[PDB]
Amino acid sequence: GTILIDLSPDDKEFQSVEEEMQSTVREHRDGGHAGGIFNRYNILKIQKVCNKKLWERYTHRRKEVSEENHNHANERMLFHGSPFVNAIIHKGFDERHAYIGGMFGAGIYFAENSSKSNQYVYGIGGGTGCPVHKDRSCYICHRQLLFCRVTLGKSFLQFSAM
Amino acid sequence: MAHSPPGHHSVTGRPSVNGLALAEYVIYRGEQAYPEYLITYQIMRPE
Numbered sequence A: 001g002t003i004l005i006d007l008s009p010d011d012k013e014f015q016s017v018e019e020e021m022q023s024t025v026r027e028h029r030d031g032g033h034a035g036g037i038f039n040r041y042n043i044l045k046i047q048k049v050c051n052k053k054l055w056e057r058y059t060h061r062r063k064e065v066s067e068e069n070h071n072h073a074n075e076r077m078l079f080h081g082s083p084f085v086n087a088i089i090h091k092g093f094d095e096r097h098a099y100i101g102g103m104f105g106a107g108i109y110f111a112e113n114s115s116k117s118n119q120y121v122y123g124i125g126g127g128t129g130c131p132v133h134k135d136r137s138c139y140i141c142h143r144q145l146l147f148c149r150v151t152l153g154k155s156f157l158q159f160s161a162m
Numbered sequence B: 001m002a003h004s005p006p007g008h009h010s011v012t013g014r015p016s017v018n019g020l021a022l023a024e025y026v027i028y029r030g031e032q033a034y035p036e037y038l039i040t041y042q043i044m045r046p047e
Ligand SMILES: COc1cccc2c(=O)[nH]c(-c3ccc(C(F)(F)F)cc3)nc12
Pocket: A079, A080, A081, A082, A083, A084, A096, A097, A098, A099, A100, A102, A103, A109, A110, A111, A116, A117, A118, A120, A123, A124, B024, B025
């Protein structure tokens, strides 16, 4: 039931998403090992993901969380990089998409920095990079990221030594 | 998949050493995220 709708580059919506992508690139402590060496992206396409069933699943849970947190969903727009992005857009997020070994616990991880999510496009630690060239810093092969609506509710603040 | 901390719906992981690093967030229910935009891109080689 998922359809993908292309946004025009002349559309303000496209432009906003591109600017969130570009403006949240940072340097990483691995020198580029996992995600590659870059300061900016070439955005090729931005598609809206439309699935009525998945949306209803989302808004029902949002309402439960909002009520439990005294009428505050604490909803954000956040990046997600994953080798399962094709599965996610069709079937929704679930336990198969969790990072079991993640340092903040076994759950589904999202980033404010686009470049942090870019580190997971080819798997944990960038895996072995792109399929065609086995290059984690491949400048040829097309990558995909999700920019997602995420309900945080009451969020536990964990400072991390990173 | 683990459970969220008691009385909480997510975790905010906030880097405390690299002051330019932004937050990371963890949810423990798939129904708390919706994949709204799909972005296709290349990283660009610095000049
Ligand atoms: C510390 O892990 C992360 C921090 C910030 C963002 C992300 C992110 O966008 N994706 C992932 C990620 C980790 C593992 C898996 C997999 F195990 F399912 F392959 C997928 C996504 N992990 C992330």
